[PDB]
Structure to design on (12 residues):
């Protein structure tokens, strides 16, 4: 959150 990561985050 708030919609933030192309390849390695949570998502998120």
């Amino acid at each position: 959150w708030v919609i933030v990561v192309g390849v390695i985050g949570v998502i998120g």
Notes: The CA atoms of residues 1 and 7 lie 14 Å apart. The radius of gyration is 6 Å. The chain has no helices and no strands.
